[PDB]
Amino acid sequence: AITSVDSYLLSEIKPRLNTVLENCYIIDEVLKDFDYQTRESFKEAFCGKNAQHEVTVGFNFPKFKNNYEAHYLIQLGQGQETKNSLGSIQSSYFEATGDTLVESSTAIREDDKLVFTVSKPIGELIKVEDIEFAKYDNLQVEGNKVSFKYQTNEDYENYNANIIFTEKKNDSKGLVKGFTVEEQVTVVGLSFNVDVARCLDAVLKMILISMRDSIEEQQTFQLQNLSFGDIAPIIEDGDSMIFGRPTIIKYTSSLDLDYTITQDINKLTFKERKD
Amino acid sequence: AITSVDSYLLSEIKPRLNTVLENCYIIDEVLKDFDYQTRESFKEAFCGKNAQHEVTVGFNFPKFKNNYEAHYLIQLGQGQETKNSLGSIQSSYFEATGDTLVESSTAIREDDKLVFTVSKPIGELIKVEDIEFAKYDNLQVEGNKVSFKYQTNEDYENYNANIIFTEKKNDSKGLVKGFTVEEQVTVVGLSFNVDVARCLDAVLKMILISMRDSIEEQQTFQLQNLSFGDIAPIIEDGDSMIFGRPTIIKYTSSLDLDYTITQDINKLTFKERKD
Amino acid sequence: RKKRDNEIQDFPAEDVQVIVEGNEARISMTVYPIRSFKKISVSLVYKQQ
Amino acid sequence: ASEAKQTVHTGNTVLLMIKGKPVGRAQSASGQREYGTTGVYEIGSIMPQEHVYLRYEGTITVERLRMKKENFADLGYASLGEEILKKDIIDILVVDNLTKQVIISYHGCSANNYNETWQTNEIVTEEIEFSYLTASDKART
Amino acid sequence: ASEAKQTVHTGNTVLLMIKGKPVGRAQSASGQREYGTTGVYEIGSIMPQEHVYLRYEGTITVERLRMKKENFADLGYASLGEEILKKDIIDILVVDNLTKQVIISYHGCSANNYNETWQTNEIVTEEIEFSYLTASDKART
Amino acid sequence: ASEAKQTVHTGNTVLLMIKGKPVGRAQSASGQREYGTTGVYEIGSIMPQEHVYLRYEGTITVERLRMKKENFADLGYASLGEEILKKDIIDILVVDNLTKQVIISYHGCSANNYNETWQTNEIVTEEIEFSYLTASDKART
Amino acid sequence: SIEKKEEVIAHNEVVFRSLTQGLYVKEVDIYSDVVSYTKDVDEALAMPNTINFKNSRLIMNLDLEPLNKIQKVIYETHLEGL
16 A cells, blocks of 8 residues: 555644634634734634635646735655565455544444444444444355344443444455655745744644544654754745744655465375385 | 644734833843843834834735834744544544633632632633632532632632633533644744844744744643854845845644534433243 | 363353443453362172172 | 554553543553463373463553652652552553553552662653552553 | 575575465574494593483573554464463474475474563564474485 | 653753752762562463562662762761761652752762772762652642 | 435534524533523534433523524435437
């Protein structure tokens, strides 16, 4: 599973940043240490549902003009290989598996079992929220749905559960070959007003903190490290300077490829010899 | 609690610098090692309540002209992440808490208890000056005020105490997620007279020494380190050069965010099974 | 711990069930009761030599 | 994308919990187990005919930064004198940050030695080493 | 070009296999053997007249990164308590990535000690040390 | 801003005090405690049925830069010969710089060994190791 | 037309609503008495819709108009011809 850190960063940042800027309480919590003036100015400009001004995020070298009132700029940076396993072997799988999904699913009644439906089939069930099925419940997964004994659990006929599971792709089996890569990605906020840049950097730090609970980087992009540069004038040739403070984010991910195996043994030929 | 080191530096420097320059005794103590000439010239120019000349402090890249007779210039500098905890967990709290406050409060008489009033409610009481309440005194905090038994302490009805306490924000509980950051901030004094710059640097060093007793950096910005650059001509294109000696200040702070928890257990369902 | 103190002789480890629902939790488990010694039947055979 | 078939544990996906309380600013922990395997040597063989288990010894260490509150001494988990004799056993749990499922739990933990370092240029640290009766990896999926 | 007359083994040409299952994210392994050679000294000689083999001791260590699944505890190969007594012997095979031929196999492996490290800034690692009855390099070409 | 819920101790928030006198230019200090836990092994079990406390041993070390005045020898706290026999016990206190509250105190401290280093390129340092009867963390809030 | 279809119930909850103002509850106090109201239908305070919870605590105020809220999310595909 080749990793595109930049796209993941963008997808995590955009909705999360919009949600954070949606409400004032979270912003006030974030900007507790800042002075009244800059805090209130940033809140007036960008914060709130009905904010007239808006921030943006995008990759570097855009052929079009880019808004320099407040923008998050991303560039890919360097990368390095840090650790390897014997034969480049990372893991072995019997059934092809895709991404790990989290889905909410209300309990349902079936003639012998309570069940939960899901969007897609199941390759493996990791966890059901606040449940530890015993032998009596006889937890079974049958494609799309997971099921447990009806009678002794009948109080929970409409349990508002949620599920963490894994997609199923194929029944084939193979080996995972790959290594670990230690990658650096640079993120910088741009603004002709330095105070806006400072507040933007603080918001960036908070959303990076919040991201650590995300499933994907919990499973794929562990060992997050941060590093901040100095406030510098990005450009001097305009009528007014652009000010930005670059930040460097580090991640560790496992670049890997699935090598299928067609060998399947189903018969044995134990015979003696004579001389 | 996101940390803005620059604003804290400014807020600590301005009143403290004004107070230090207010009186001559402290300045004479500071400038003991310097020669008579420069010491007395600086005292004549800047020291004293009725000083005609005055120093200033502000951030870098101001669009307006800035006074270059004597000024403290700040710029943010670099930063780095140095240490982490398991799961990025820093601390656990049952009640939301804000800043740590110190308030003076004269004792008061209540029909059963001596009490101290405070400006704001109490989340936690750290210390009461020169007091170690015993069981007999039965120390209790009830929102705004703290109280102890009247009878055996009646000699102290007007005790001129002071209190170190913590604000109360909410009754909710959550987890503190974050890490430690090792940050560098640059401070430089500017003056077209080199001797004034030297004296200004000495004053800066003294106020940095004095700051170490401050509550906030005792609680937030531990491990202060200093580094001084060489006296250099900041600018040569004017009629006369600007001379300044940059200084680098290091700090360690814990960037963190409070993650609330809505799960509260209040009932138990211990039941057996049959087969 | 109880087994280490001989208070219980045996039990199934995997039989436990736990369910949480808002502010409530359900716990279900099984333990085998101890069995005491009740009956003995004896027969004798007399023989020569 | 996130294929769970290759994921590994790290410091950001683990929690150290005691009595439900997550210990704060915990840095590292190590676990050791010794089965005391020994071989059996006959007269007519240099090779060991078989190995046998004899003795189970296990210790776990924890490194922490001394918070001003809820340190191991204040929590009552550790001890500094005869107060130790009244301290009962504890269970130390390593639980997954993502699912809150258990990864490994130590039962009947008891304290062995206590170390604290006061230093000028670095944050205060303390180390504790426990001896436990048994380990368990139950309560899985 | 590739002249096989000078090739050597490396981490990319080796697989570590147990019960047919390739253990994943395995990092290193070391093998030790001691024949316990001792000399015989006569009265009329400082020199050792001859050496003799007396005792065969051998251990193998394995270092691994704890995957969230199929860790040594979950696989049942290791143990954490009295469950060990019901664990039978195993054979650990080092097999060539290219040909799938065997390079060296350890027979009758038994576990000696178990180590796991939880750390904040690094991936979790675990180490196991086994004691084996005999080694073999058979099944070659 | 300063949220006390996450604060930790460092070299700038601690004082080392003896007899009320703050010792000057003190660099580091380490504290050790050993409860001497031992297990109990029955015949019918490899596992330790229980652990028991047996023996309390504790030492504290202090590193200092030898000031020209008020060194440990001049203060009378240390000793250099038979003068030691007339030296009574002392209590070494670690007290908070902010509040002047106590963090940990060692009672009945007695000196174990004394080390001093004279070097050409570095400031003079001396080290003392004490053995104490009991430790205490009382007098808190 | 439809080639394949499946329906699942993502959530099933009980929403509380005022009888006079018509606004739903947003935030509450320690006893869970109302302190804030909202016009949104989804953001409103809600609890799981199962009998066990109902027996485990209507209880806060006499404005006795709860609302059983059920969310249906449907996956489907079409093969529309030319």
